Amino acid sequence: EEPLPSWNDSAARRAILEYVKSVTTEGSPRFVPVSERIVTFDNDGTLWCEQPMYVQLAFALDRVRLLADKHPEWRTEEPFRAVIEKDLPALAKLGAKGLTELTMATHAGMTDDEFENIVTEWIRKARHPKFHRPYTECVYQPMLELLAFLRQHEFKTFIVSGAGIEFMRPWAKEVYGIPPEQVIGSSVKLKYELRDGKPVLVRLAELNFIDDQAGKPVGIRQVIGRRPVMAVGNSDGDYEMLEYVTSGPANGLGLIVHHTDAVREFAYDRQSPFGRLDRALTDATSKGWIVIDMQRDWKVIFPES
Amino acid sequence: EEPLPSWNDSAARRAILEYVKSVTTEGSPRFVPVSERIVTFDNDGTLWCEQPMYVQLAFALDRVRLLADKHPEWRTEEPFRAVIEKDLPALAKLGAKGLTELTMATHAGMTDDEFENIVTEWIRKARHPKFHRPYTECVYQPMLELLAFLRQHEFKTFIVSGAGIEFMRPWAKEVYGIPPEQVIGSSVKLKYELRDGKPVLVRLAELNFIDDQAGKPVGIRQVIGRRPVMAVGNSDGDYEMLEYVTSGPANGLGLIVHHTDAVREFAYDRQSPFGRLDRALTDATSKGWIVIDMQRDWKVIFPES
Ligand SMILES: [Ca+2]
Ligand SMILES: [Ca+2]
Numbered sequence: 285e286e287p288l289p290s291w292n293d294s295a296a297r298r299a300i301l302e303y304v305k306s307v308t309t310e311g312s313p314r315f316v317p318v319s320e321r322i323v324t325f326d327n328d329g330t331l332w333c334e335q336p337m338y339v340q341l342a343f344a345l346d347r348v349r350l351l352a353d354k355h356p357e358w359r360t361e362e363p364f365r366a367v368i369e370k371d372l373p374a375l376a377k378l379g380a381k382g383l384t385e386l387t388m389a390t391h392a393g394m395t396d397d398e399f400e401n402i403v404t405e406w407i408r409k410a411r412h413p414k415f416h417r418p419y420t421e422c423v424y425q426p427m428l429e430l431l432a433f434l435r436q437h438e439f440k441t442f443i444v445s446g447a448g449i450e451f452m453r454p455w456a457k458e459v460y461g462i463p464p465e466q467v468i469g470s471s472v473k474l475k476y477e478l479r480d481g482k483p484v485l486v487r488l489a490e491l492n493f494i495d496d497q498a499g500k501p502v503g504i505r506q507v508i509g510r511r512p513v514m515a516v517g518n519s520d521g522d523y524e525m526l527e528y529v530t531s532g533p534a535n536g537l538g539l540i541v542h543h544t545d546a547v548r549e550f551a552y553d554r555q556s557p558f559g560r561l562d563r564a565l566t567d568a569t570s571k572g573w574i575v576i577d578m579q580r581d582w583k584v585i586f587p588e589s
Numbered sequence: 590e591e592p593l594p595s596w597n598d599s600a601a602r603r604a605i606l607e608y609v610k611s612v613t614t615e616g617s618p619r620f621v622p623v624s625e626r627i628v629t630f631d632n633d634g635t636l637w638c639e640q641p642m643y644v645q646l647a648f649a650l651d652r653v654r655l656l657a658d659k660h661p662e663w664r665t666e667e668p669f670r671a672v673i674e675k676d677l678p679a680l681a682k683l684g685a686k687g688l689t690e691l692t693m694a695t696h697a698g699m700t701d702d703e704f705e706n707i708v709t710e711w712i713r714k715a716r717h718p719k720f721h722r723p724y725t726e727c728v729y730q731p732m733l734e735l736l737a738f739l740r741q742h743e744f745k746t747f748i749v750s751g752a753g754i755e756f757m758r759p760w761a762k763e764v765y766g767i768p769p770e771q772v773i774g775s776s777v778k779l780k781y782e783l784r785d786g787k788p789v790l791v792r793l794a795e796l797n798f799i800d801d802q803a804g805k806p807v808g809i810r811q812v813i814g815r816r817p818v819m820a821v822g823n824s825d826g827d828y829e830m831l832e833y834v835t836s837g838p839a840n841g842l843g844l845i846v847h848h849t850d851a852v853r854e855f856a857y858d859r860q861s862p863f864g865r866l867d868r869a870l871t872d873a874t875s876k877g878w879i880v881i882d883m884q885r886d887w888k889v890i891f892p893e894s
Contacts, residue, residue, distance in 0.1 A: 319762065319768055322770075396810060440770070449811075449814070453814050457624065463624055463814075464813065464814025464815055465627075465745070465770075465812065465813045465814055465815065467814065471811060473807075474807045474810060474811065475803075475807070476803040476806045476807055476829055476833070478836075478837075481836070481837060482836075482837035482838060483806065483829075483832050483833045483836050483837050483839070485806060485807065485810045492811070498780075498781040501781045501788065501790060502778075502779045502780070502781055502790065505701060505779060505790045506754075506776060506779065506797070507770065507812060508769065508770045509754070509758050509768075509769025509770055509772065510769055510770065524781055524788075527788050528781070528788045531783075531786070531787075531788050532783075532786060532787035532788050533787060534788070
């Protein structure tokens with residue numbers, strides 16, 4: 285049909301269409317005013333691919349390798365040692381905090397614009413080792429359809445990710461239709477100064493915020509100032525975001541992207557170092573969280589090139 | 590004329606109309622794509638009245654008075670002593686940091702929703718000691734017109750204030766047409782938990798962010814992810830915000846609300862404990878900042894009741 289053409293008939297497609305209709309039709313008992321139609325998405329594993337590692341970790345790896353010729357101490361200092369020796373099991377222990385700390389330690393003292401240029405150049409030159417396309421083409425076509433569908437019904441679509449806010453902001457508008465003011469992520473602190481008479485923001489070697497696990501409802505409440513009426517995630521790091529939206533007196537809709545398709549994408553859940561999905565999957569039924577089976581529910585995974 | 594009906598012919602009205610036309614007309618050399626049309630306003634002294642004190646300070650005063658029966662130590666502990674003894678000169682030393690610390694110390698341990706209810710009840714019951722109307726009716730009608738005019742031309746209007754984000758969010762949408770996700774302010778840290786099975790955010794006795802002076806470009810860059818193309822302020826605390834927008838290679842528009850009208854509002858600048866305007870006023874000409882003379886440039890100050 286017209287809406288969600290890459291989605292087969294499934295629990296998830298039925299729930300999405302029913303819910304959006306119910307909250308946007310004047311006179312419906314569940315009608316939500318346009319201004320309150322906030323929906324939050326994780327990025328890694330929800331909107332795009334996160335195997336064999338988080339894309340920002342791939343970026344951090346290349347950056348460390350490029351910088352390593354000035355750092356004899358990195359042959360022994362963690363996590364740089366793991367990065368240099370290509371030790372993927374060690375790197376899986378970083379999490380959101382470790383990933384932003386690694387990025388923080390390697391890009392302090394430069395401006396926001398300098399960092400953006402670095403990210404932009406990397407994300408157009410690097411490619412996925414499996415798909416041999418830019419990482420920004422390893423986005424999920426069915427989720428692009430979902431984003432458009434929601435925006436057509438006057439939802440504001442936000443990203444709420446553990447990844448670095450400034451890693452996603454350079455390309456999220458072009459790729460997802462999501463502007464920088466609707467991207468929430470982990471961050472370092474900034475300092476204002478003038479350089480050559482030019483006002484700039486400079487990155488500090490200090491953490492500002494880690495937007496994962498119980499951090500997600502905090503990031504949402506601080507930045508958006510509203511409880512979202514819908515949320516989509518894929519891992520146990522999304523548990524609190526989904527709960528905040530769906531549980532107690534709130535009656536919002538939560539969905540989980542379940543990676544079940546080893547042929548067209550990757551199959552993983554409870555054992556995965558990246559995007560581990562276990563506790564949230566077990567509790568889905570009791571919470572009313574609707575699970576998207578990628579293998580069965582999506583007609584295509586990625587957009588045509 | 591149709592646009593800005595409460596604005597007389599003035600440098601400010603000419604600059605606003607010219608600039609908005611220039612950046613929103615297809616084919617103009619200064620055309621700014623719709624997605625980039627970000628404008629930032631201070632609140633206190635820019636959108637509404639801040640004499641005889643910041644409205645949030647009035648709120649904090651009432652809250653301290655209500656709570657004082659449980660705090661024998663407040664007879665000696667500052668700033669509570671000053672609040673109790675009605676010592677306005679001492680209270681003028683607080684600034685944005687002190688104001689948020691005072692609010693932080695008196696509302697820790699309650700939920701975001703509990704705090705919102707407290708603010709909402711106060712702001713509808715309290716009244717300005719001069720105008721004898723709710724503080725939310727002591728907003729500037731010409732600025733309401735400016736906000737509408739900008740939104741009609743597809744600008745996104747943000748507040749960027751030193752005051753508490755959660756003090757403004759309960760009423761800013763109704764009063765200014767600005768939703769919570771477009772309010773930037775000072776804040777305390779939050780913690781996620783469940784209370785009676787209900788997911789909530791709880792206020793901590795810990796500062797998160799102070800959004801004043803050189804903090805304003807930081808708050809803007811972190812939350813919005815964009816340099817605004819226009820900004821309006823009124824005090825020296827807005828200097829960095831205006832500079833960030835107008836100076837160096839950026840060529841945005843900055844305006845300053847100058848309180849020159851003692852008859853219809855308040856007259857103050859260089860000597861005022863609240864909304865002190867001195868360094869920014871002296872530098873306005875050199876920066877290209879356009880000064881709004883309230884006495885001469887505005888046909889009315891407040892909306893009709
Ligand atoms: Ca994820
Ligand atoms: Ca001000």
